[PDB]
Design a protein around this ligand. Structure first.
Ligand SMILES: O=c1ccn([C@@H]2O[C@H](COP(=O)(O)OP(=O)(O)O)[C@@H](O)[C@H]2O)c(=O)[nH]1
Ligand SMILES: [Mn+2]
Length: 286
């Protein structure tokens, strides 16, 4: 048998109608279109609390290749994360309870060594293709590339990196694609735990003094959590990241188009081609 792992955040879903609607659109599209071979098996991980764990199990019954469903305890992962991720919530969430928002960053240390690869996914997504196809992007990784991640389709990182761009007028940090680095979106993340455990550079970029050094270089104080870490790391060492085509995560949020970036917005939001996964971020309907 061959294992394919997906991870999803499903916290505070109890008495949440907007969230449960999203998780219905997401999980229904995922499973209705997901097709695997008979020997191999799809593993669906969830980090949820006892309360939302019930909500998930109840939702999966309506929608059930074998597909094993694993539930991770929110508190257990948080408690495991905290000693590793304390020194970077003061830069990317600029107190203890909010350690679970940096899960992707330390996925290799939290997950068992038995798991070599995982795809962490948002629940405001809509799947337009078979999810087995996305796993094929792992093969397109360069050696020394640890994370598969789609680029950010809003000029958020213009505003976040403002002081660095103010000081470096020639920089590509915060610039639109294809010539510039717009930053990353955390909605669809291909985490190569095997590569993460083995990459010395990534092992060092997780350390406090390194984080401090790099945040200070970019004058970085963000609020986007794990997404902020990868994005900032992506500016220094872009080769750690395998940039997924925009069609694998087409964010639909247009907030910044109407709140300051009307002119440059398109250069970030643009994504030509047949969409494979939609991302209805900032509550944008699909
Ligand atoms: O109350 C919540 C809200 C969100 N999420 C999860 O965290 C992810 C990030 O939230 P959201 O989609 O709002 O992020 P955005 O893409 O809007 O920045 C979602 O996909 C959900 O899986 C959660 O567990 N509880
Ligand atoms: Mn989202």
């Amino acid at each position: 048998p061959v294992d394919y792992h997906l991870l999803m955040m499903f916290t505070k879903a109890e008495h949440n109608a907007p969230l449960q609607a999203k998780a219905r659109v997401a999980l229904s599209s995922l499973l209705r279109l997901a097709k695997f071979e008979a020997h191999e098996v799809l593993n669906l991980h969830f980090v949820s609390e006892e309360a939302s764990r019930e909500v998930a199990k109840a939702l999966l019954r309506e929608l059930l290749f074998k597909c094993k469903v694993i539930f991770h305890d929110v508190a257990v992962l948080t408690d495991k994360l905290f000693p590793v991720v304390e020194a970077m919530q003061k830069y990317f969430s600029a107190y203890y309870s909010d350690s679970i928002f940096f899960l992707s960053v330390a996925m290799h240390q939290i997950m068992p060594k038995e798991i070599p690869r995982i795809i962490q996914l948002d629940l405001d997504l809509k799947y337009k293709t078979n999810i087995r196809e996305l796993f094929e992007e792992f093969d397109n990784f360069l050696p020394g590339a640890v994370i598969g991640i789609a680029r950010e389709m809003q000029p958020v990182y213009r505003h976040t990196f403002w002081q660095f761009r103010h000081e470096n007028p020639k920089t590509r940090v915060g610039d639109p694609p294809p010539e510039g680095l717009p930053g990353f979106n955390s909605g669809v993340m291909l985490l190569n735990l095997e590569a993460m455990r083995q990459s010395p550079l990534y092992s060092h970029l997780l350390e406090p003094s390194w984080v401090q050094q790099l945040a200070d270089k970019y004058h970085f104080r963000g609020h986007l959590g794990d997404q902020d870490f990868f994005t900032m790391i992506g500016m220094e060492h872009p080769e750690l990241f395998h940039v997924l085509d925009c069609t694998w995560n087409r964010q639909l949020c247009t907030w910044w188009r109407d709140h300051g970036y009307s002119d440059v917005f398109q250069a970030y939001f643009r994504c030509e081609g047949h969409v494979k996964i939609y991302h209805g971020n900032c509550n944008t309907p699909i």
